[PDB]
Design an enzyme around this catalytic site. Structure first.
Site, short mmCIF file in Angstrom:
data_model
loop_
_atom_site.label_atom_id
_atom_site.label_comp_id
_atom_site.label_asym_id
_atom_site.label_seq_id
_atom_site.Cartn_x
_atom_site.Cartn_y
_atom_site.Cartn_z
N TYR A 49 -90.70 -21.29 -108.25
CA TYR A 49 -90.18 -21.79 -109.53
C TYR A 49 -89.39 -23.09 -109.37
CZ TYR A 49 -90.42 -16.61 -109.64
OH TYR A 49 -90.79 -15.29 -109.46
N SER A 50 -89.62 -23.83 -108.29
CA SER A 50 -88.79 -25.00 -108.00
C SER A 50 -89.40 -26.04 -107.06
CB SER A 50 -87.46 -24.53 -107.40
OG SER A 50 -87.68 -23.82 -106.20
N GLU A 51 -88.80 -27.23 -107.09
CA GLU A 51 -88.94 -28.23 -106.04
C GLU A 51 -87.53 -28.62 -105.63
OE1 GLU A 51 -91.36 -31.48 -107.63
OE2 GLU A 51 -93.17 -30.32 -107.16
N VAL A 52 -87.27 -28.69 -104.31
CA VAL A 52 -85.95 -29.05 -103.79
C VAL A 52 -86.05 -30.42 -103.10
CG1 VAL A 52 -84.00 -28.31 -102.33
CG2 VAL A 52 -85.42 -26.59 -103.47
N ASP A 155 -82.58 -10.76 -103.30
CA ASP A 155 -83.68 -11.47 -102.63
C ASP A 155 -83.20 -11.89 -101.23
OD1 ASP A 155 -86.32 -12.45 -102.40
OD2 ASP A 155 -85.90 -14.33 -103.46
O1 LIG Z 1 -90.94 -24.59 -98.72
C1 LIG Z 1 -90.01 -24.50 -97.64
C2 LIG Z 1 -89.05 -25.69 -97.70
O2 LIG Z 1 -88.27 -25.57 -98.93
C3 LIG Z 1 -86.88 -25.75 -98.58
N1 LIG Z 1 -86.01 -25.09 -99.59
C4 LIG Z 1 -86.40 -24.21 -100.51
N2 LIG Z 1 -85.34 -23.85 -101.24
C5 LIG Z 1 -84.28 -24.51 -100.79
C6 LIG Z 1 -82.94 -24.53 -101.17
C7 LIG Z 1 -82.04 -25.35 -100.50
CL1 LIG Z 1 -80.39 -25.37 -100.98
C8 LIG Z 1 -82.47 -26.14 -99.43
CL2 LIG Z 1 -81.36 -27.16 -98.58
C9 LIG Z 1 -83.81 -26.12 -99.06
C10 LIG Z 1 -84.71 -25.31 -99.73
C11 LIG Z 1 -86.74 -25.09 -97.23
O3 LIG Z 1 -85.57 -25.58 -96.57
C12 LIG Z 1 -88.01 -25.62 -96.55
O4 LIG Z 1 -87.77 -26.95 -96.04
#
Ligand SMILES: OC[C@H]1O[C@@H](n2cnc3cc(Cl)c(Cl)cc32)[C@H](O)[C@@H]1O
Ligand SMILES: OC[C@H]1O[C@@H](n2cnc3cc(Cl)c(Cl)cc32)[C@H](O)[C@@H]1O
Ligand SMILES: [Cl-]
Ligand SMILES: [Cl-]
Ligand SMILES: [Cl-]
Ligand SMILES: [Cl-]
Ligand SMILES: [Cl-]
Ligand SMILES: [Cl-]
Ligand SMILES: [Cl-]
Ligand SMILES: [Cl-]
Ligand SMILES: [Cl-]
Ligand SMILES: [Cl-]
Ligand SMILES: [Cl-]
Ligand SMILES: [Cl-]
Ligand SMILES: [Cl-]
Ligand SMILES: [Cl-]
Length: 333
Positions: A49-52, A155
């Site tokens: 549900y996201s992109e970080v 989770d």
């Molecule tokens: O799909 C895996 C990649 O997604 C990054 N990731 C996913 N949710 C995240 C939340 C935070 Cl706060 C961070 Cl720093 C990285 C995240 C994970 O750190 C990894 O680099």
């Protein structure tokens, strides 16, 4: 005759003793920030549900992490936001510094304190005995805090623990499935990733509590000390419970079922059948012996119980002999 009622043995009434507005997130209203104050630097990843992204606040050049939400049930957005705000300043819980809107979709973008882009799963199969104890303790600090604040994570898994191994700093992330605990409330069992789901979820027992996180935690510990990923490798929801039953034995499973008067399908019982308990020492091999101590197994045994009410609380876990020395850590980087 239906299933027997349950309430948490700890932090039972923490939400009851707080104002309605603490937990009634459906009536929260978001104070938006300025999207223009942030600029994205690079993509860390994209998930369900996201992109970080890595980003910067251009007002002071402070590096931050930005999670842009993909469209979800609007009630759940308010839920996560309110939970993260409630938890801010907790030990080892990710810090929500702002909330902005996505220039494109106008979806919410959560701005967090910066954390290094390494998750626990990338490191956790190659830690020392000492570091497993250390980081387990740090995870417990987070769980005891969020439980004490009336929040179930729901989770708990390796992918949801970020680590900065160099600075021995750890953050529990991914609070999108988190929920406020309220005694008597029946909860959706579609929480937690398969390998980490507690027997309560797998038998559709809905009146569960914070102790679900302790089962997930136990699953993480077993994986680390036995070097088995995942410890309970189910292929479907039913087989997840079968895998657990082939280690802990069916005797205690059917005692748990009988305790809470749970609705178990006889056709599932036929497949469950009878399995002997497989003493925790059975999963030791030459590869992993240096990780498996009597205190580790005692600890694991006290987390991985069918009966959610028998499981160690986070505070009880923190007092377990497994952590006796590591609490004395001298913070060498
Ligand atoms: O799909 C895996 C990649 O997604 C990054 N990731 C996913 N949710 C995240 C939340 C935070 Cl706060 C961070 Cl720093 C990285 C995240 C994970 O750190 C990894 O680099
Ligand atoms: O010059 C246009 C500026 O808009 C920023 N931007 C683009 N998409 C974004 C999504 C979010 Cl959640 C944020 Cl906080 C900034 C964004 C870009 O990072 C860029 O710095
Ligand atoms: Cl509610
Ligand atoms: Cl807000
Ligand atoms: Cl994971
Ligand atoms: Cl997150
Ligand atoms: Cl729910
Ligand atoms: Cl839910
Ligand atoms: Cl499910
Ligand atoms: Cl298995
Ligand atoms: Cl049996
Ligand atoms: Cl055995
Ligand atoms: Cl030993
Ligand atoms: Cl049990
Ligand atoms: Cl707890
Ligand atoms: Cl104990």
């Amino acid at each position: 005759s239906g299933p027997v009622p349950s309430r948490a043995r700890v932090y039972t009434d923490v939400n009851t003793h707080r104002p309605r507005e603490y937990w009634d997130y459906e009536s929260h209203v978001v104070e938006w920030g300025n999207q223009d104050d942030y600029q994205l630097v690079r993509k860390l990843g994209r998930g369900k549900y996201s992109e970080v992204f890595e980003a910067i606040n251009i007002t002071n050049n402070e590096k931050v992490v930005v999670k842009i939400l993909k469209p979800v049930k609007k009630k759940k957005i308010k839920r996560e936001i309110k939970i993260l705000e409630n938890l801010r300043g907790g030990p080892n819980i990710i810090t929500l510094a702002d909330i902005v809107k996505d220039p494109v979709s106008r979806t919410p973008a959560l701005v967090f304190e910066h954390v290094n882009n390494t998750d626990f799963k990338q490191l956790y199969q190659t830690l020392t005995d000492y570091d497993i104890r250390f980081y387990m303790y740090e995870i417990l600090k987070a769980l005891d805090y969020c439980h004490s604040m009336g929040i179930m994570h729901r989770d708990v898994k390796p992918h949801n623990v970020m680590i900065d191994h160099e600075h021995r700093k750890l953050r529990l992330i991914d609070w999108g499935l988190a929920e406020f605990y309220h005694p008597g409330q029946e909860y959706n069992v579609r929480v937690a990733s398969r390998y980490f789901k507690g027997p309560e979820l797998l038998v559709d027992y809905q009146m569960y509590d914070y102790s679900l996180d302790m089962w997930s935690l136990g699953c993480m510990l077993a994986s680390m000390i036995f070097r088995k990923e995942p410890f309970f490798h189910g292929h479907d929801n039913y087989d997840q419970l079968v895998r657990i039953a082939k280690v802990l034995g069916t005797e205690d499973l059917y005692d748990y079922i009988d305790k809470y008067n749970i609705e178990l399908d006889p056709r599932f019982n036929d497949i469950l059948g009878r399995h002997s308990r497989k003493r925790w020492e059975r999963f030791v091999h030459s590869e992993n012996q240096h990780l498996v101590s009597p205190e580790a197994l005692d600890f694991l045994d006290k987390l991985l119980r069918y009966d959610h009410q028998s499981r160690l609380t986070a505070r009880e876990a923190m007092e377990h002999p497994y952590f006796y020395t590591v609490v004395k850590d001298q913070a060498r980087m």
